Amino acid sequence: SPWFGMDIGGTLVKLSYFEPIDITAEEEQEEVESLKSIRKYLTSNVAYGSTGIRDVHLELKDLTLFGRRGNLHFIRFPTQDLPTFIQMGRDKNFTVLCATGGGAYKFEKDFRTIGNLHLHKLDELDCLVKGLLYIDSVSFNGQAECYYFANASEPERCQKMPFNLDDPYPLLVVNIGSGVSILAVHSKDNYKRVTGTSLGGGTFLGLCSLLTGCESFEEALEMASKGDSTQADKLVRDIYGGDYERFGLPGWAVASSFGNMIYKEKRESVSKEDLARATLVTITNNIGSVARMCAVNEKINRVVFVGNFLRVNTLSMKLLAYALDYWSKGQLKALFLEHEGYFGAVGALLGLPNF
Amino acid sequence: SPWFGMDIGGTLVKLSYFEPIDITAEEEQEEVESLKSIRKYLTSNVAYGSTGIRDVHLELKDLTLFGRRGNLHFIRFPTQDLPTFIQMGRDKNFTVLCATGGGAYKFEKDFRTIGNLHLHKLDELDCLVKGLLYIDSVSFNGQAECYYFANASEPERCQKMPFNLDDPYPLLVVNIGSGVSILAVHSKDNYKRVTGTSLGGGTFLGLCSLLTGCESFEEALEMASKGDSTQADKLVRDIYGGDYERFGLPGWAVASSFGNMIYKEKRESVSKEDLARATLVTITNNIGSVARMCAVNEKINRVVFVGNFLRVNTLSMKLLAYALDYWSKGQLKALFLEHEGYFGAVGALLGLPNF
Numbered sequence: 265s266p267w268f269g270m271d272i273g274g275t276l277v278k279l280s281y282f283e284p285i286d287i288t289a290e291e292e293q294e295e296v297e298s299l300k301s302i303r304k305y306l307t308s309n310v311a312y313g314s315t316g317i318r319d320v321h322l323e324l325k326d327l328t329l330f331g332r333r334g335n336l337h338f339i340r341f342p343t344q345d346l347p348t349f350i351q352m353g354r355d356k357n358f359t360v361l362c363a364t365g366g367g368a369y370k371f372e373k374d375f376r377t378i379g380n381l382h383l384h385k386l387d388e389l390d391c392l393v394k395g396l397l398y399i400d401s402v403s404f405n406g407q408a409e410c411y412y413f414a415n416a417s418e419p420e421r422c423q424k425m426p427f428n429l430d431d432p433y434p435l436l437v438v439n440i441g442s443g444v445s446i447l448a449v450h451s452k453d454n455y456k457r458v459t460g461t462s463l464g465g466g467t468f469l470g471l472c473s474l475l476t477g478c479e480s481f482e483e484a485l486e487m488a489s490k491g492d493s494t495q496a497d498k499l500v501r502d503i504y505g506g507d508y509e510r511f512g513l514p515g516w517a518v519a520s521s522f523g524n525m526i527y528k529e530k531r532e533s534v535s536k537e538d539l540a541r542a543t544l545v546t547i548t549n550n551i552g553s554v555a556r557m558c559a560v561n562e563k564i565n566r567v568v569f570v571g572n573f574l575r576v577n578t579l580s581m582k583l584l585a586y587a588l589d590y591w592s593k594g595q596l597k598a599l600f601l602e603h604e605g606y607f608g609a610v611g612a613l614l615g616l617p618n619f
Numbered sequence: 620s621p622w623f624g625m626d627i628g629g630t631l632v633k634l635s636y637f638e639p640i641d642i643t644a645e646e647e648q649e650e651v652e653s654l655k656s657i658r659k660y661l662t663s664n665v666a667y668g669s670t671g672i673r674d675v676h677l678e679l680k681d682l683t684l685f686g687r688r689g690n691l692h693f694i695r696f697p698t699q700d701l702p703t704f705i706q707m708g709r710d711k712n713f714t715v716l717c718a719t720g721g722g723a724y725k726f727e728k729d730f731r732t733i734g735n736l737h738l739h740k741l742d743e744l745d746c747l748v749k750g751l752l753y754i755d756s757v758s759f760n761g762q763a764e765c766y767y768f769a770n771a772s773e774p775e776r777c778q779k780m781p782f783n784l785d786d787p788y789p790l791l792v793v794n795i796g797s798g799v800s801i802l803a804v805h806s807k808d809n810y811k812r813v814t815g816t817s818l819g820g821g822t823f824l825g826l827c828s829l830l831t832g833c834e835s836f837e838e839a840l841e842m843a844s845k846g847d848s849t850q851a852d853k854l855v856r857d858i859y860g861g862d863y864e865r866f867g868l869p870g871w872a873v874a875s876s877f878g879n880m881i882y883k884e885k886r887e888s889v890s891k892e893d894l895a896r897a898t899l900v901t902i903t904n905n906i907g908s909v910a911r912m913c914a915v916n917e918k919i920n921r922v923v924f925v926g927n928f929l930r931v932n933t934l935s936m937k938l939l940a941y942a943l944d945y946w947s948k949g950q951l952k953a954l955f956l957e958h959e960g961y962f963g964a965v966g967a968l969l970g971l972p973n974f
């Protein structure tokens with residue numbers, strides 16, 4: 265029985281797979297052909313079908329788990345293609361699946377079309393916390409799982425640097441997926457969802473597809489990297505002529521996101537790249553402001569950002585870093601994690617002894 | 620010297636004008652022709668040029684102010700047309716102007732092209748608080764200035780009803796203009812800006828103009844009233860197949876605003892009206908969530924929404940009413956005000972004895 269953990273989100277399916285590497289001569293000879301066939305397919309390919317990708321760089325090598333040495337693999341595909349994944353799962357050639365995310369419920373009846381399959385569902389928040397605390401405790405092949413941006417307010421000094429979660433309590437976890445959930449973790453047993461926002465990575469991608477015609481998340485990020493968001497955004501200085509110093513708003517801060525788009529003349533001169541950047545900046549800053557308000561409210565100064573909205577997205581990471589640093593006068597730290605999108609999948613996999 | 624108060628915003632200029640009605644026979648005969656000419660122009664017209672409007676329905680009749688009986692008029696035009704207002708102010712025919720808003724600073728040098736004019740600038744937040752507490756204390760021609768939506772969670776029962784601010788402390792004031800400023804008013808002397816958000820009425824109008832081609836705020840509201848925002852928004856049930864009951868998210872709540880727009884097929888079947896509604900719903904709910912988080916943080920259960928984003932906008936008012944009521948289990952009251960956009964202009968006018 266292959267060891268999988270699956271987090272089925274609104275947008276992406278995330279899959280963690282533990283490949284045993286201590287396979288004895290007897291076990292290897294007595295391996296079922298279809299089980300041996302899955303292991304070879306998963307480790308001999310980095311693209312699966314037309315939409316599955318294995319994030320080779322995230323692999324945890326020579327991990328001990330359930331008393332076996334093996335490697336932890338990380339795989340992702342769009343939730344839209346889960347039916348293809350399932351139809352191939354029913355391939356005549358071919359087992360316990362721990363699943364979390366909204367789609368463990370939505371697609372429960374579909375998984376049970378695989379006759380030799382028992383589906384155990386696990387709570388999304390439970391799996392996220394367990395997964396995060398586990399990955400950080402085994403480290404990233406000896407490197408820190410958790411990093412931050414030192415001197416996030418100074419550009420010529422800003423650089424990524426490791427961060428130590430040896431005691432990670434208390435902790436605010438901001439999960440930026442399709443939407444946004446915010447968790448307060450006080451201990452490994454005491455955590456709660458304190459709020460969320462529907463203005464998440466789906467909002468960026470949805471709005472940006474509407475405004476610019478971009479076809480992918482990556483194309484949107486690369487358009488955004490070429491844009492100037494101040495072309496679409498009305499700034500404090502467009503209203504004051506300078507700074508609003510009585511309340512500490514500098515002239516370059518955004519007063520109204522997309523506020524310059526109320527003028528036909530400005531809508532006509534704005535580029536898709538500007539709009540892509542304005543969308544990203546607007547979604548990111550609003551998340552950072554909500555996160556800041558929860559942190560102050562929960563009296564928690566470490567805020568960890570996870571989820572896939574930040575994959576290959578350094579612009580948002582820096583925006584979040586700079587924003588928490590600036591508005592909090594340094595008392596709030598934005599924290600990031602190499603395995604950002606996969607913690608639910610890992611936490612699900614860790615629920616395997618419970619069945 | 621005419622008595623004006625002017626709040627020059629990022630989008631709209633708001634003007635309060637006190638028309639004296641106790642004009643004695645001597646004063647009337649000895650009135651300067653150009654001062655008599657301004658009074659007749661302002662009270663004999665409801666549209667001024669092509670963009671000025673007098674909100675006749677908001678007039679405060681037979682008010683006593685600075686020891687004179689008169690009427691309080693409320694006028695608005697786009698900040699874009701302030702230069703026209705000023706060039707006509709320099710008309711050879713023709714005096715102290717108290718001004719607030721970012722534009723009192725931005726256009727300070729322009730006002731001084733009017734030779735017989737002394738410009739005194741006043742702080743925006745100061746004027747807002749003074750104006751609000753003053754209008755509510757003189758009432759709306761005997762009716763309550765402040766109202767709310769009783770049973771905001773039940774549709775067949777939801778109705779506007781008066782609300783009493785005889786003691787209005789503490790108070791959270793959420794000013795939804797181009798952007799959003801949030802004030803905590805603990806007393807008439809002790810108030811502070813506690814946060815804000817750049818996702819304000821300019822964001823709704825800017826995004827909606829981009830997405831739908833609407834030419835005006837009113838056209839956007841009327842498009843929104845015909846739309847179905849769930850066509851653009853991904854809901855909890857699109858992800859879970861139903862409710863996320865472990866954390867009390869019903870299946871109809873928005874999981875990801877505009878989240879369904881990541882699918883080419885859905886972008887192709889969505890209508891401008893749907894997009895108009897999704898924009899309004901997304902901006903409004905995010906403001907209501909931020910407001911809820913400040914209220915809980917400031918330990919204040921009365922939240923007053925002002926600014927012009929809500930003029931002729933009952934959909935947003937109800938969304939804000941329902942949202943504060945629902946998420947707070949009834950302990951938070953959304954409050955609204957007949958004179959929503961004009962409190963800064965009134966507060967400025969009240970600074971007149973100080974000069």
Ligand SMILES: Nc1ncnc2c1ncn2[C@@H]1O[C@H](COP(=O)(O)OP(=O)(O)O)[C@@H](O)[C@H]1O
Pocket residue numbers: 272273274275276277365440441442443464465466467468469481571572573574575605
């Ligand atoms: N390859 C990708 N395909 C689609 N969306 C991506 C991709 N990479 C990053 N994203 C972003 O991640 C977000 C979803 O992150 P994720 O945490 O997996 O969400 P969910 O749990 O809702 O599926 C998307 O909204 C998008 O902004």
Ligand SMILES: Nc1ncnc2c1ncn2[C@@H]1O[C@H](COP(=O)(O)OP(=O)(O)O)[C@@H](O)[C@H]1O
Pocket residue numbers: 627628629630631632720795796797798819820821822823824836926927928929930960
């Ligand atoms: N006639 C209108 N023209 C333009 N915007 C309007 C109008 N009526 C309502 N609005 C909305 O009010 C918002 C501005 O409100 P207001 O409080 O006057 O802002 P500001 O102080 O920044 O000028 C606009 O963003 C728009 O959403």
Ligand SMILES: CC(C)(COP(=O)(O)O)[C@@H](O)C(=O)NCCC(=O)O
Pocket residue numbers: 273274275366441442443444445459460461462855858863868872873874875
């Ligand atoms: C409902 C969700 C937990 C779904 O999880 P996801 O697929 O985004 O990982 C998340 O989208 C969310 O919390 N959205 C915010 C909804 C709200 O709090 O109003």
Ligand SMILES: CC(C)(COP(=O)(O)O)[C@@H](O)C(=O)NCCC(=O)O
Pocket residue numbers: 500503508513517518519520628629630721796797798799800814815816817
């Ligand atoms: C800067 C402003 C006070 C300008 O006032 P306005 O013209 O919107 O009435 C307001 O747009 C605002 O507070 N925006 C939010 C900016 C922020 O807090 O990040």
Ligand SMILES: [Mg+2]
Pocket residue numbers: 273274365441442608
């Ligand atoms: Mg998720």
Ligand SMILES: [Mg+2]
Pocket residue numbers: 628629720796797963
């Ligand atoms: Mg204003």
